[PDB]
Write a protein that binds this ligand. Sequence first.
Ligand SMILES: [Pr+3]
Ligand SMILES: [Zn+2]
Length: 547
Amino acid sequence: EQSIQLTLGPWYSNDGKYSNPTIPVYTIQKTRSDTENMVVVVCGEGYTKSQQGKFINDVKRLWQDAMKYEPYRSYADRFNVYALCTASESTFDNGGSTFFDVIVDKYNSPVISNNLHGSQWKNHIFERCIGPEFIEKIHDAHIKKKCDPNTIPSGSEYEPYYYVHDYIAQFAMVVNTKSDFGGAYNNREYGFHYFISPSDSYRASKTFAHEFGHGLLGLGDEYSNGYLLDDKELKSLNLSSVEDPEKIKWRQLLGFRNTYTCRNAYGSKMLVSSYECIMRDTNYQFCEVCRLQGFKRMSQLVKDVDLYVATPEVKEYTGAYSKPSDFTDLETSSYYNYTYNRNDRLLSGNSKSRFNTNMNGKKIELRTVIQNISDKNARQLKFKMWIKHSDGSVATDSSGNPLQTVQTFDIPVWNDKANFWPLGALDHIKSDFNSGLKSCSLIYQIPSDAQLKSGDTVAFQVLDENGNVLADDNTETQRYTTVSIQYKFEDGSEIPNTAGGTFTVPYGTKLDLTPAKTLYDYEFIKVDGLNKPIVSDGTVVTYYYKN
Ligand SMILES: [Pr+3]
Ligand SMILES: [Zn+2]
């Protein structure tokens, strides 16, 4: 019943196959008003009308897998996700008429082909046709359409549609295929902000997360080549050509986790902050620079996130990799020697048990990086680190003083915030990487007379101004729990055109989001499952709406 209808003239459907399509809308996730969340619109390519159930399930699978990656995972409940069941005449594999005219070119790139049927504006379909109709009818802002997409505007062909990518944070097109490909089309000045990825390739979920990293998070392809000119250096969130560690944009992250600048290939002038990143090789996670930049980017699209605390680590402090000149060699051999050295020193996460009674007289370092998201409030965070016996008690020296140290760190305001992909931006041009950013290092000299026992480990906390624990020595390896969303009428019926998905949260999380007052035209009644610790996989939060 819930749908949008398009009018596709010859510029969008020159063969008449999709002149007046009805597109069923499915809500996969709507946790808050569209005006407070990042709205993601996903359409299917090469799914026939009888395959739309497969399409919906494919979107849920790809989306749920994407939300397992940081930094998306920290925002998982602040996305609203809609699946638009665009029906193709042919399956993709059969090779006939499809909704989006996607072809795979000789570089293995999936491209919307305007020339396939001579639909001269086919690759403008998201921001000129689908987007405006969705934002008028489905999106809570209900912005009325401004221009007829089948006519030529007066003046700019593009400006009337710029608003679309402020109300829809990302368009994704899932192709019904096992073929391994992926493409991201980011050029907001000319209306383009979508990506294309396959439903069933061997790495479908990894590709989706990678292309989403290009599209939403603004991250550059870490496999690309060349020396970045000054303007492109300023423009790039996660690539550099600056060889001098004292000058490179992400200098504050050097030596934190696997952040060690290196060439992305032998002899390359293109540098990455970590050789192991999903933006270079889809088998990896997002590196710390990409997590920081992506977290900052998404914070611009919601209103209630004001701090980023990267997962802290503890390392034996030997002096290795502690000053800029330790980072001057940019070869992969240096990157891996660095990561090996880190593992030899690690005392946190799954290396907590490497602590031992030979640690007396050694130094240990608690390290993380903190980004203030506020442009108004400076922050003061207190770090505490101590030696903990296996029974939970605090270890002492031989005079009974606790083996504990504390240090407060000042995090300056993000004064440069308006230069970093704010709402309405067509591109990112220049930002000060260090604005609002503070690398925090707390070094503790374990006394020579420490009364260490077998099974001791390093404990720590990062505390806000009120003593709330923002991260601790359990954060990195804590258990995550799956939460399922369901949309129901007051009589218990499942609401049509919903397909509530799952995401994960840390065990014990209390969800505290204000439900959207409407779902389609249905009025919100009540929700069951918010504000209570999530302690079981398959926990269901049920949003009840009026029939
Ligand atoms: Pr009614
Ligand atoms: Zn990266």
